[PDB]
């Protein structure tokens, strides 16, 4: 899986194909964070295969649909439990992020896990995602935004329009 | 000096240029290699086939007579269907006349 663009949360339901022994096999569900649905179904078969004697040939996808964020206009803290392979082992991690959508927090996770650990998305298995209350957060980087009277300036504002004009008579100002 | 010893590299590529053709099959195979004692009698069976020639004619004609005698006793949408009928050059020949006559 390539963590291309902002990921989406998918609800994927599958089962074993019915057989004479078990005319109605049980249904299984998974939360899949993927770029599109075609990827979402592929990763489902990769996870259920790891947990059950199942695979695409001997099973079917009963339902694939996007799970929309329930409060996209509200700030939340997310706790993400994941395991990943490094160059020399496998590790479990718990990470926290502040976002508006759960799929956004997961996308932050992939970009962050790539930045801080050189982890490609094919080695990362997100186990669990939960919305966490400000009192239950552990990471100091997230907790410092739990401040009802938060305030801070924007020092040394870098000039981003550096080629319009390309040549100018006046030097830029970084204080605003 | 020393050289390469053996390889089959490039050999399945050459074999398939003119195809690995299967052997030709005829409906009559040669009796070469069959049991000499059994082949001797088969030749004798063929050699006297003509002995029962008259008997075969009588049965075949008799069998034909019975065979002939037994025989001689024994013997999408309704709109689109209609349009497909009219558009048929033969079947719709009269129908096309009817619409033309009425049109006039």
């Amino acid at each position: 899986m390539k963590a291309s663009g902002t990921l989406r949360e998918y609800k994927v339901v599958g089962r074993c194909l019915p057989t004479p022994k078990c005319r109605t096999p049980p249904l299984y569900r998974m939360r899949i964070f993927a770029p599109n649905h075609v990827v979402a179904k592929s990763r489902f078969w990769y996870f259920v295969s790891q947990l059950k004697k199942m695979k695409k040939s001997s099973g079917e996808i009963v339902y694939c649909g996007q799970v929309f964020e329930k409060s996209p206009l509200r700030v939340k803290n997310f706790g993400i439990w994941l395991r990943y392979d490094s160059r020399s082992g496998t590790h479990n991690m718990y990470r926290e992020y502040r976002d508006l959508t759960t799929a956004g927090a997961v996308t932050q996770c992939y970009r962050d896990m790539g930045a801080r650990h050189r982890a490609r998305a094919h080695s990362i298995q997100i186990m669990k995602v939960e919305e966490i209350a400000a009192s239950k957060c552990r990471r100091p980087a997230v907790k410092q935004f739990h401040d009802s009277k938060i305030k801070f300036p924007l020092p040394h504002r870098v000039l981003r329009r550096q080629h319009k004009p390309r040549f100018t008579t006046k030097r830029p100002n970084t204080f605003f | 000096a020393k050289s390469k010893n053996h390889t089959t590299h490039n050999q399945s590529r050459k074999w398939h240029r003119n195809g690995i053709k299967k052997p030709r099959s005829q409906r009559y195979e040669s009796l070469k290699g069959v049991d000499p004692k059994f082949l001797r009698n088969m030749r004798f069976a063929k050699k006297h086939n003509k002995k029962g020639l008259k008997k075969m004619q009588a049965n075949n004609a008799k069998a034909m007579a019975a065979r002939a005698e037994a025989i001689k006793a024994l013997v999408v949408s309704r709109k689109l269907h209609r349009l497909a009928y009219i558009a048929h050059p033969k079947l719709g020949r009269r129908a096309r006349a009817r619409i033309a006559r009425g049109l006039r």
Partner: protein
């Protein structure tokens, strides 16, 4: 290089299976082979007479000659870029009736009956096989049970 020995490389091929050595069951000798029959060649090491050559072990041929103890088999052999129809004499211990055509002969009889029976009943029945089609649309009842949620398990060094 290797040797050109007749039985080189047949240590396992011609050996008898596990705890299946000893006497050869006599039903092996009671089978009836007729000209045109399809037989699977399988060398049996218990009988060293009329042994098929290793290249013919696991090939399937056609009977063309029948003698007191053996049969003549026309079996394709590929040598380099050509295939040769080879004629071998193999004692009937080292062969068995091929069941590859039996499924076909069963189908021919079933086909003809359906063809005959349907003809007198004025109906068109399917006769040609078909590849497995994509499965048709269907409903999956949940029976008021939420699908079980699955999650990946944590890593553990169970070393």
């Amino acid at each position: 290089t290797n040797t050109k020995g007749k039985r080189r490389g047949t240590r396992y091929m011609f050996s008898r299976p596990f705890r299946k050595h000893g006497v050869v069951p006599l039903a092996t000798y009671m089978r009836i082979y007729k000209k045109g029959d399809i037989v699977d060649i399988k060398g049996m090491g218990t009988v060293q007479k009329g042994m098929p050559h290793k290249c013919y072990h696991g090939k399937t041929g056609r009977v063309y000659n029948v003698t007191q103890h053996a049969v003549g088999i026309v079996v394709n052999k590929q040598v380099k870029g050509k295939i040769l129809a080879k004629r071998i004499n193999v004692r009937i211990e080292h062969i068995k009736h091929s069941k590859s055509r039996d499924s076909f002969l069963k189908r021919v009889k079933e086909n003809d009956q359906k063809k005959k029976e349907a003809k007198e009943k004025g109906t068109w029945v399917q006769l040609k096989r078909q590849p497995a089609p994509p499965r048709e649309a269907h409903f999956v009842r949940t029976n008021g049970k939420e699908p079980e949620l699955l999650e990946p398990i944590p890593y553990e060094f169970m070393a």
